[PDB]
Design an enzyme around this catalytic site. Structure first.
Site, mmCIF file in Angstrom:
data_model
loop_
_atom_site.group_PDB
_atom_site.id
_atom_site.type_symbol
_atom_site.label_atom_id
_atom_site.label_comp_id
_atom_site.label_asym_id
_atom_site.label_seq_id
_atom_site.Cartn_x
_atom_site.Cartn_y
_atom_site.Cartn_z
ATOM 1 N N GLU A 357 0.825 -1.204 0.000
ATOM 2 C CA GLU A 357 0.000 0.000 0.000
ATOM 3 C C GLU A 357 0.862 1.257 0.000
ATOM 4 O OE1 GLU A 357 -3.003 -0.009 -0.596
ATOM 5 O OE2 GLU A 357 -3.627 -2.076 -0.205
ATOM 6 N N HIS A 487 -14.837 -11.744 -11.452
ATOM 7 C CA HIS A 487 -14.434 -10.786 -12.474
ATOM 8 C C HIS A 487 -15.197 -10.967 -13.780
ATOM 9 C CE1 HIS A 487 -10.965 -9.924 -9.839
ATOM 10 N NE2 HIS A 487 -10.935 -11.233 -9.664
HETATM 11 ZN ZN LIG Z 1 -2.523 -3.437 -4.822
#
Ligand SMILES: [Zn+2]
Ligand SMILES: *[C@@H]1O[C@H](CO)[C@@H](O)[C@H](O)[C@H]1NC(C)=O
Ligand SMILES: *[C@@H]1O[C@H](CO)[C@@H](O)[C@H](O)[C@H]1NC(C)=O
Ligand SMILES: *[C@@H]1O[C@H](CO)[C@@H](O)[C@H](O)[C@H]1NC(C)=O
Ligand SMILES: [Cl-]
Lengths: 595, 198
Positions: A357, A487
């Site tokens: 992150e 997805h």
């Molecule tokens: Zn990521």
């Protein structure tokens, strides 16, 4: 005044207003995510609808420029990103129908629940329970029945919806001067108007096939090894020369083979490198982990995080009184506001996720000086690759022992190295064939090369041929296995996980050369490498203001995708598998089936 | 001796500054030029001097001590300097090439930012031509970006020149508000009735 001046003025006004409104919308969404309350929900809702309406009206106003007289590539790209009509090209009826189809697909996939013949009131949904079984259940019949029932329940209901969604998206994209929706998806990698760096949509499929041609051998040997190792755990069900069942891959869809490490462990006597207990002994916390990640990132030569990051970001769960989504998230609210939302625990997984992150936030800050329409990565795969290279370089033993997590009285050996390489291959290279075959099947369906009465047949044949996964039982054509995936039913591109998986190693091998590495690629650490950090920042700063090929050339030196770094990463693992993959015939016979 | 010191705090310690398109100008011509600006938030983000050195400033006489003030973003302070290009320098506030004075800028996030956004500060974004040095333009006429005059209505190719800021406390250092004040000094070949303290 030529059209160029009008375009520049409109783009400046749009930049300002969209920056303001997008900051507002991101702030509302952050307030909602960090605190699930009806008031924050209403704030997110009204902010989102106002931002979307503003964007739509601006795009409507942007279409008033022919775009052929303009010559500035920057304004050209901004208009192309803003002039895309989108779903509004079709008549309103088709729009409402497609929206309803998408909504019902998503809800049926989310609200899907399977009833079982074991008890009239023993239904379990997908995320909890069913995944637990598909991951840890060692019984053949149990996981087989679960894998069959989930599909028979979800795909059979989604097939009438997919039959409509496919044709609707085909008629939508074709109206946008495209060949099909599959080609519309490939438009992300489209580069035009710049000779020497151009890239057509059709070249993507050819390049992907060329890269898979080289990915095949390593995956073939890995599959042979996994099969040879599964014969002891699931005897009387697996073939020596045949394919593997679909319910023995460790997950509902077999996308990742992480759950197979417990069964295909090369040397289970020695445990893997885990610094979990070593952290609690030193009284570590989210703050310390994030500050260590900061020190690591700045050591490479990147700017340190904004003051508002440590002040506004919520890095630890405050408990079940301020409820929030516990998913690791990077928040770029805009206008210099960056935050990370993550329920950081004291675990190595949380350490790697925080590194990821922080790398994503660094990338976001790199191109902060670019226009709003260009404040994004080079493509859909560059961001995740830049985020994963950091977690890769951080998980190395040398880095763990340099910062004080790993004890200095411990020198890595070949056994643990092979274990780690194989466990990484279970998720990195083990999922490449799945993504490749899924994307190829979706492209062929969107293009119409597969008739409606051959969807599942072609799907299963391609599975057997490429991934080497055979169907456990005969499947009627009313089934829909592809729709069972998130997805696919949620209308999300899946090729990003392949191109990104290749860009990851392309960058890893490109930065190791700058750090003057002297060993295998899996032991490289970009820490304290100022030249590699600067070479990476010179590309992250560009963002979307330049073609993705030129950006790739800045770091890796190549204009096109390359998979040789991926094979070089697993070269020791490849040699070990080749040395071990000689007790049985390598490969699989697609003609064999368990039924 | 002392006659009466400068009300410099009236411009450095003002409750609220003026916008850029309507930057204020206060003439200090009959006050003892005591340059002790350090006490106004000593941690200045940008304390640069043009044509005069920092401290020797306090012991030099001048005819006019014009003081201009306005609020701009942190990343826009670089535009407030001799020979600069951008939105502010060209359309809002332009300094002469041979400017002899000082430019003081300090952060004002707490004061000029609200949780809901401070939209009181406006700035010009479009103009027919670049402004001259020390030029002030309050015109709010619709900038003609197209071919027709638009008859003075806001629409396609006819945008309003002034735009808002909307400062918020969550903005980054680059976008936070910055109260800037300029100390212009010029000699008009006239008797300098007042000077600084000895
Ligand atoms: Zn990521
Ligand atoms: C295009 O416009 C941008 C923004 O005005 C400018 O920075 C760039 O130099 C221009 N490029 C040309 C003249 O092609
Ligand atoms: C950047 O790092 C230095 C050294 O740790 C520190 O003094 C400074 O406050 C940091 N700045 C920011 C914006 O975090
Ligand atoms: C990086 O430099 C620091 C400080 O000299 C050192 O402690 C650390 O071990 C180095 N890391 C590596 C593996 O280069
Ligand atoms: Cl499947």
């Amino acid at each position: 005044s030529t059209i160029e001046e009008q375009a520049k003025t409109f783009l400046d006004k749009f930049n300002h207003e969209a920056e303001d409104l997008f900051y507002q919308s991101s702030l509302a969404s952050w307030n909602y995510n960090t605190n699930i309350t009806e008031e924050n929900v209403q704030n997110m809702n009204n902010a989102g609808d106002k931002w979307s309406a503003f964007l739509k009206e601006q795009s409507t106003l942007a279409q008033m420029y022919p775009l052929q007289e303009i010559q500035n590539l920057t304004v050209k790209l901004q208009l192309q990103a803003l002039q895309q009509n989108g779903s509004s090209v079709l008549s309103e009826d088709k729009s409402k129908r497609l929206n309803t189809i998408l909504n019902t697909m998503s809800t049926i996939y989310s609200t899907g629940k399977v009833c079982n013949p074991d008890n009239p009131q023993e239904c379990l949904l997908l995320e909890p329970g069913l995944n637990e079984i598909m991951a840890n259940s060692l019984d053949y019949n149990e996981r087989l029945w679960a894998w069959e029932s989930w599909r028979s329940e979800v795909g059979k209901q989604l097939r009438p919806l997919y039959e409509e969604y496919v044709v609707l998206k085909n008629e939508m994209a074709r109206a946008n001067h495209y060949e099909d929706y599959g080609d519309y998806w490939r438009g992300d990698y489209e580069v035009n108007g710049v000779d020497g760096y151009d890239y057509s949509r059709g070249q993507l499929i050819e390049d992907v096939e060329h890269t898979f041609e080289e990915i095949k051998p390593l995956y073939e040997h890995l599959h042979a090894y996994v099969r040879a190792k599964l014969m002891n755990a699931y005897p009387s069900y697996i073939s020596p020369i045949g394919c593997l069942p679909a319910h023995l891959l460790g997950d509902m869809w077999g996308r990742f083979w992480t759950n197979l490490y417990s069964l295909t462990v090369p040397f289970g006597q020695k445990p893997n490198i885990d610094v979990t207990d070593a952290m609690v002994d030193q009284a570590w916390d989210a703050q310390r982990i994030f500050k260590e990640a900061e020190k690591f990132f700045v050591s490479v030569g990147l700017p340190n995080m904004t003051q508002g990051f440590w002040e506004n970001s919520m890095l630890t769960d405050p408990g079940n009184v301020q409820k929030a989504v516990c998913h690791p998230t990077a928040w770029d609210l805009g206008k210099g506001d960056f935050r990370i939302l993550m329920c950081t625990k004291v675990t190595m997984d949380d350490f790697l996720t925080a590194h990821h992150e922080m790398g994503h936030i660094q990338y976001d800050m790199a191109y902060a000086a670019q226009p709003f329409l260009l404040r994004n990565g080079a493509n859909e795969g560059f961001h995740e690759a830049v985020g994963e290279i950091m977690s890769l370089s951080a998980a190395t033993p040398k880095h763990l022992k340099s910062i004080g997590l790993l004890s200095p009285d411990f020198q890595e050996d070949n056994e643990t190295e092979i274990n780690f390489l194989l466990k990484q291959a279970l998720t990195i290279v083990g999922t490449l064939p799945f993504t490749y075959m899924l994307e190829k099947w979706r492209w062929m369906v969107f293009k119409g090369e597969i008739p409606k009465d051959q969807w599942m047949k072609k799907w299963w044949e391609m599975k057997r041929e490429i991934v080497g996964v055979v169907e456990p039982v005969p499947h009627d054509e009313t089934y829909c296995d592809p729709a069972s995936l998130f997805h696919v039913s949620n209308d999300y591109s899946f090729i990003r996980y392949y191109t990104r998986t290749l860009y990851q190693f392309q960058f890893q091998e490109a930065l190791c050369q700058a750090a003057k590495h002297e060993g295998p690629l899996h032991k490289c650490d970009i820490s304290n490498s100022t030249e590699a950090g600067q070479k990476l920042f010179n590309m992250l700063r560009l963002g979307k203001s330049e073609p993705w090929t030129l950006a790739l050339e800045n770091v890796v030196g190549a204009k096109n995708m390359n998979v040789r770094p991926l094979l070089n990463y697993f070269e020791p693992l490849f040699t070990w598998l080749k040395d071990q993959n000689k007790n049985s015939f390598v490969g699989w016979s697609t003609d064999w089936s368990p039924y | 001796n002392i006659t009466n010191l400068c009300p410099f705090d009236e411009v450095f310690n003002a409750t609220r500054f003026a916008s850029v398109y309507a930057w204020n100008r206060k003439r200090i011509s009959n006050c003892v030029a005591d340059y002790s600006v350090l006490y106004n938030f000593a941690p200045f983000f940008a304390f640069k001097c043009y044509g005069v050195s920092p401290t020797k400033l306090n012991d030099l006489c001048f005819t006019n001590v014009y003081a201009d003030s306005f609020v701009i973003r942190g990343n826009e302070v670089s535009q407030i300097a001799p020979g600069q290009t951008g939105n502010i320098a060209d359309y809002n506030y332009k300094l002469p090439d041979d400017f002899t004075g000082c430019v003081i800028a300090w952060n004002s996030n707490k004061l000029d930012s609200k949780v809901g956004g401070n939209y009181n500060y406006l700035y010009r974004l479009f103009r027919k031509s670049n402004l001259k040095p020390f030029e002030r333009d309050i015109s709010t006429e619709i900038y003609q970006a197209g071919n027709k005059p638009c008859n003075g209505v806001a629409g396609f190719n006819c945008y309003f020149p002034l735009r808002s800021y909307g400062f918020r406390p969550t903005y980054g250092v680059g976008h936070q508000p910055y109260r800037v004040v300029v100390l212009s000094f010029e000699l008009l070949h006239a008797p300098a009735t007042v000077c600084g303290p000895k």
